[PDB]
């Protein structure tokens, strides 16, 4: 029943600050160190430090001392991390983890921090229809900021044969594509719809794939 629920992805301007949360449940919060780990995109893991919520004792990695501030609230079973004077090097996924025993046994899902002066923008969603036995269809999710978007097919009813590609960044904008493979007998008699969500711009787009002809 040990769980660590982390706050949502955040965008922060260079030189600004962010405060991230990690809500613990399923154990005595005050009886274990709650630790923070940083992972830059496509990079390794770096230990930031630990907090003991029972007495607010902290141990920091020296390199994060002027950067990170760990706090904990006994009442709400919540740990926080404040990141100051934000620079591009601070854009990363921040994990909270419980040191249950000799090492970190339970981890939060991570909170993504994007340090940027770029503005939130919704994507455009384009259907990808063929221009035998099995047909491949797709959706182009172009020009959005920030990450992430969620892509589903037929509200999640089509999960097998789906390839949702990692987004590519160009001119402060992300572009992503998703492909679905179905039997040729099923399309177009049975409808194929990609469901695109961009939470930062409160966008939910349903795109029906129609045969070109």
């Amino acid at each position: 029943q040990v769980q660590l629920q982390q706050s949502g992805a955040e965008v922060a301007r260079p030189g600004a600050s962010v405060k991230l949360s990690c809500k613990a449940s399923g154990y005595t919060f005050t009886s274990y160190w709650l630790q923070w780990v940083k992972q830059r995109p496509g990079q390794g893991l770096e230990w930031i430090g630990a907090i003991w919520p029972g007495d607010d004792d902290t141990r920091y990695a020296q390199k994060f001392q002027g950067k990170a501030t760990m706090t904990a609230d006994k009442s709400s079973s919540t740990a926080y991390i404040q990141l100051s004077n934000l620079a591009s090097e601070d854009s990363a996924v921040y994990y909270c983890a419980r040191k249950g025993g000799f090492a970190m046994d339970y981890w939060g899902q991570g909170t993504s921090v994007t340090v940027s002066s770029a503005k939130t923008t919704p994507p455009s969603v384009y259907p990808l229809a063929p221009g035998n036995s099995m047909v491949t269809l797709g959706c182009l999710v172009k020009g959005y900021f920030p990450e992430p978007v969620t892509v589903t097919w037929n509200s999640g009813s089509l999960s097998s044969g789906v390839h949702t590609f990692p987004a590519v960044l160009q001119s402060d904008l992300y572009t992503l594509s998703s492909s679905v493979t179905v039997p040729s007998s099923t399309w177009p008699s049975e409808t194929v719809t990609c469901n695109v969500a961009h939470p930062a711009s409160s966008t939910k787009v349903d795109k029906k794939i129609e045969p070109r002809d």
């Binding site: 005595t28 009886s31 274990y32 630790q35 430090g49 630990a50 003991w52 249950g100 025993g101 000799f102």
Partner: protein
């Protein structure tokens, strides 16, 4: 046949020298998994060599919110009295007068 405690320790009684030149300390466990063996070691200042000896036979955490007595024979001169695993690890300085 207990495994080592994984949580932290609080100093309840700071190091005191006995009349036999030994040292006594009282630490209280914070954490779980008890009964468990208290991780204890004495090192040189460079933290390269384990020195001295534990006099307390197998110190175990047996009670909630109660101190555990530890007696040890440290080496002559400066040493670190190290208790518990990281990141809560206690690192206490001690100087024992004399020579062998």
């Amino acid at each position: 046949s207990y495994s080592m405690c994984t949580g932290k320790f609080k100093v309840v009684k700071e190091i005191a020298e006995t009349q036999h030149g030994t040292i006594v300390i009282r630490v209280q466990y914070e954490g779980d998994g008890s009964p468990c063996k208290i991780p204890f070691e004495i090192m040189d200042l460079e933290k390269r060599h384990v020195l001295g000896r534990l006099i307390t036979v197998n110190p175990i955490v047996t009670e909630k919110d109660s101190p555990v007595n530890i007696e040890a024979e440290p080496p002559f001169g400066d040493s670190y009295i190290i208790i518990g695993v990281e990141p809560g690890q206690l690192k206490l300085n001690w100087f024992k007068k004399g020579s062998s």
